[PDB]
């Protein structure tokens, strides 16, 4: 294992947290002359702040809107927070680490904190299936090899 | 008479004699759809 | 205007939920960099809302100002709002009841909406002391030189 | 039939925390075969310790089992703890602080953390309807007649 | 032995969830008595199972020990199971796609789940470590000296 | 067995490495301190 060459790339967890949260329930006691079929329109966005040397702050929003149409269910968006140590990578790679894996990191907790505000404000719970950009070239690069075989046992 | 033994502690609570359960307030929440208008990430 | 002095009333817990929440960590990673406890300033605003015929909803507003040296720590608000089914009482009983009495039953829900927004933010844990209105509320009749003004209303 | 001596007392909230924590989903990839709401039986349990003099530690237990048809969907439990501090009540008006009033502390807290562990399981919400404790300790009892808090005024 | 991207395989993200949620905190008011510095062992485990007609549940078995010696803080465990319809590759990549790629989808959610616990137990935030499980097992098969960054297409 | 099995799943991963903690900076917060009074007016 010659470690020469930046393909691993140092990243480091130092923190994440929420920076912001937020909830609104206009139509709350409505909720019972409501009809629960409002449509989820999801809203992403990703940020970046250096911090320091190596170390960039990236902050992961999402916003849920659920409405039947002005007869709205909730807005709940939640500025997930992330100070992470970037090294090895730079520029359009970089770009790729902060505005798609990084935002991925964040996004279970903003997704948890926004489903727990749901619950909070008593609306149907609904989960976002996972959306990976980051990952999606490692679905397109496929490697080289295929064949595995011999295993079974050595004693 | 001050029986210094009893203290202040006559009583754990160890049970809430909870014989009416439900689920929430008669009104059904459980209902919504709508995600994903498209399909999974290949 | 009523005094209303009558236990025939009835008085049910129909459903308690969060109108609006906020969390605000503006200088995030900077008062992290801080290694002290925070100045929490306790912020108390109330509403409420008729839904129906002695059917009225109160939102209880506890907000977090907290601040460490001259410069933020985190901001919190949660307007927690709870449907009480109150019949049998009007008048400045009602205005007990809906002003002292639900507020301190929305009260321990406030603190947790509160308590998991500084726990997200991996600020230390906020418990707010337990406040009854209603013993504040007795001795307010007898302190009174004059005046007398208050706002609830609430969508 | 009341006979509860009213005092000025002293309380205090030391520390609330979750103890323990159980999300079973023995059904997990069979759970999308089952399409109701599901028969959920939720149950209540407190186990009480006294940690020091004045000064002891309730925690409230609350379980959570559901199946649709004849078959598990999901189980769930958590277990909040608290350490509370208390002078000046005694008998029936201490029995009665760690028999509802602390119970009702730690509710909002259990209850919200299952619905954030149904979350985490991507299915339909789980939240707790609002458990009278205190009417629940008179029903254990059938009516509050105590009396206590005596003037051991020596010199 | 290289160019041989036939449309073979299949591959889809039908559910990443909590098949499982633990945490135990023994000693959680007796956290209060000890010093705040416990030894992190984070604990890894990885398994498939065939549901359907190639399609198999990959669970990550995360597991976060907190103990000063005998002396344990808390303990955490997060069976962060997810469903994937996989086939149409073969021996390497297949092993490669439940075992390094399948884990490493459940990785970020896994972590969350841990975190949160950790939080409501009033404990310090616990931050898993990103182990690339992709990254290492294509590194020590041959690549021990060898880089391979990502063509950036719009679609 | 001793003659052909091979599983669909096999995995060897006998280059299991990866840190450990990543904790430096042990800011003291747990619970907040300065919060309220010792008034908690009943």
Known sequence: ?155 | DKAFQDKLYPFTWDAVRYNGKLIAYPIAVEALSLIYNKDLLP
Chains 1, 3, 4, 5 share one sequence.
Not at chain 1, 47 to 60: H, I, K, N, P, R
């Open chain 1, 1 to 155: 294992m010659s470690e020469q060459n930046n393909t691993e790339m140092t990243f480091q967890i130092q923190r994440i947290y929420t920076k912001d949260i937020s909830f609104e329930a206009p139509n709350a006691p409505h909720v019972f002359q409501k009809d629960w079929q409002p449509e989820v329109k999801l809203d992403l966005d990703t940020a970046s702040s250096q911090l320091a040397d190596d170390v960039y702050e990236v902050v992961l929003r999402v916003t849920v809107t659920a409405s039947l149409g002005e007869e709205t269910a909730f807005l709940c968006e939640v500025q997930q927070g992330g100070i992470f140590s970037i090294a090895g990578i730079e520029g359009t790679q970089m770009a790729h680490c902060l505005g798609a894996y990084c935002p991925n990191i964040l996004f279970p907790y903003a997704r948890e904190c926004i489903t727990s505000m749901v619950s909070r404000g008593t609306f149907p719970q609904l989960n976002l299936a996972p959306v990976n950009f980051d990952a999606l070239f490692m679905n397109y690069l496929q490697q080289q090899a295929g064949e595995g075989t011999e295993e079974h046992q050595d004693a």
